[PDB]
Symmetry: C2
Subunit: 403 residues, 2 copies
């Protein structure tokens, strides 16, 4: 079985741009092969939502809107799932060597969605009219590239010729280069300004024990990035020291995790020590964009830019739910580890967000809620989270679970 | 002979820079088969720390000192500013020997800012890549209207590891592809356009193609205008029918699709055939109602679609628009023809239609030929049609066929 790339667009309206690209890719694939043996099949793919029907492209193996729509603003949402799943499948026969697509606003968003469900490392490219603006929605935590089109996508000219030529070259080199070619155990750890004592320490120890590290700034995306690399198969254990992202979720901060937090790790059945890193705060900023439902709470303006808000006792009770829920479904080994005195630089004896009534409630609540579960151990400990003796715990708890 | 540049802050990112450059070299070489010549990879330090780095593996290497030489408060920023300016000037020189085949870089937040400015001054077409911790955010500041490509770094730049090995590897192969492909190897006009002028442009597009010209159509969105002007400066667009100058409007009143004070200079500096006109000067862009500067809650507010609202320009405002255009036009060191539609400047400024007001349109007309009367390069044609009548369209194209070779 030989390797195959996909050139994907809306074919009814952009046949000429897409033929141009497809041609240039196949050509460039061929010109850049060395060790080779295989040529890479270049198949064009239509994802037009219109009733208009184009059923071949040049000579290329082609696949019309239907064949894609068959796989299980609402026009985009349909066809993108169709693509995503259409691509899930081709990945499986195990010779999807890349994806490429062109598109303006609506199309970019369509492709973006399909492409970034592919394994990190498979080359994902889109020549896009909306590359040069705001791309978070499109790229996210993936490695998707977006080539600015410079001019609109309307037929081949002067400019589109070079721009499309360059992106085909780009994509052909990626795909060959990867056809024509880890060692360590990487762990990943989640950090916040106010929890680095703990994380720095653990990163240190981890390095000396022989393990490699990937720290994530728990910004929601940060968390999700981690899980999308474990899921990928890059991160072989986690120490989720900082779970503040959960707090921003149940009360609605500006750096929330979404409701799938932890699944990816548990689904991949990999060593998972965990803790309450920074559960004491939910994030916002500046003051007036903070909702008027709590202009009477314990806030700590960190910058003009960001503002932190201290989690009430009741809110921490809710954090203990979310985490325990997910934890209790644990298909393999786990270990919670709680700092009793405080969960953050600011939740410190003397400091601004100190409250052990909180961080005791949170400690018990999770001691009880996880009480039954066999795999998930729990270790309440007589420390603050930053005390490097905690760090020893975490790395030790982890050392236990791991090979 | 051709040469590429791997540019970074060696001081802190040495391993990643070397790895990247190694992969670029490999990929260059392997992809170049079949062929001869062979592309040099030059590593270059754009570090602002004093920490000196003087080599990297076996590559022709240029440290900070040597960059900073050829350059023509809050220090960090200032140091970035200068390093960036330095780099820009270093690449220009690199490019003058016609031997700059490509440029690739790595950066975090500040590094993307440093590399970006410097890379987008190089001609469209020369491969320009950056692997960046801030690809997956808000990139207009960096990419502007250029072909700069930002690959998302996926994790931090933070030593070699599984993830950055594959990302860096795909970026270097991407880049080596763009570089070899390009190494191995009419009269275009541009036209500004708004919804309410698509009759006019569509019809001018059609006529021009039949006359044997290629056409590029830019949404007059502020960006669009600059987009076009940078491409004329880079020789991709040899004449312009600037039908729709609505941007000039959003500028003086303060809209969401504002041009800037440089509008027209590129066209004139290139000395290229410029037919111009008053397209959609009857309106100024906002969206939505709710955010419209409270000082006019009484002006004629059109709702186009929830997110986007238009506001009818007053006579005082048109008088100004004239000045801006006149002033800039008067600098013409070459041929230029205005063409004014006497009847209207928009589907919205049409007998029966909301933004009608032939006072504005006469004011504008008179004010323009007044201020250009003396300029004998500019030929102000007043035409008894509406902007969207296919005879105006021919008018435009004739005026253009006139000035052009």
């Amino acid at each position: 079985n030989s390797p195959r790339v996909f050139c994907i667009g809306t074919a009814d309206t952009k046949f000429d741009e897409l033929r141009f690209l497809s041609e240039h890719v196949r050509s460039s694939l061929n010109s850049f092969s060395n060790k080779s043996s295989f040529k890479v099949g270049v198949t064009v793919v239509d994802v037009s939502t219109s009733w208009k029907e184009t059923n071949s492209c040049a000579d290329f193996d082609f696949v019309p809107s239907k064949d894609v729509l068959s796989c299980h603003g609402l026009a985009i949402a349909i066809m993108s799932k169709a693509l995503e799943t259409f691509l899930s499948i081709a990945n499986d026969e195990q010779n999807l060597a890349g994806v490429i697509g062109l598109g303006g606003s609506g199309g970019t968003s369509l492709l973006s969605s399909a492409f970034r469900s592919l394994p990190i490392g498979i080359p994902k490219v889109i020549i896009s009219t909306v590359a040069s603006g705001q791309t978070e929605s499109y790229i996210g935590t993936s490695d998707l590239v977006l080539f600015p089109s410079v001019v609109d996508i309307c037929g081949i000219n002067n400019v589109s010729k070079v721009v499309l030529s360059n992106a085909g070259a780009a994509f052909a080199g990626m795909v060959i280069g990867r056809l024509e070619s880890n060692g360590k155990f990487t762990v990943g750890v989640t950090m916040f300004g106010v929890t680095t004592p703990c994380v720095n320490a653990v990163k240190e120890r981890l390095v000396k024990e022989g393990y490699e590290t990937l720290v994530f700034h728990a910004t929601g995306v940060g968390g999700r990035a981690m899980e999308d690399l474990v899921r990928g198969g890059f991160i072989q254990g986690v120490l989720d020291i900082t779970t503040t992202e959960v707090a921003d979720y149940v009360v609605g901060g500006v750096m929330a995790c979404d409701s799938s937090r932890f699944d990816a790790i548990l689904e991949k059945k990999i060593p998972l020590v965990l803790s309450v890193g920074a559960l004491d705060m939910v994030n916002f900023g500046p003051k007036t964009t903070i909702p008027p439902e709590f202009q009477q709470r314990k806030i700590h303006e960190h910058n003009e830019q960001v503002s932190l808000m201290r989690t009430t006792v009741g809110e921490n009770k809710k954090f203990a739910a979310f985490i325990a829920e997910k934890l209790n479904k644990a298909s393999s080994s786990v270990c919670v580890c709680l700092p009793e005195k405080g969960v953050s630089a600011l939740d410190a004896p003397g400091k601004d967000f100190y409250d052990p009534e909180a961080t005791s409630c949170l400690t018990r609540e999770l001691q009880m809620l996880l009480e039954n579960n066999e795999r998930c151990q729990v270790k309440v400990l007589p420390y603050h989270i930053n005390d490097a003796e905690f760090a020893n715990a975490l790395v030790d708890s982890f050392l236990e679970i791991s090979p």
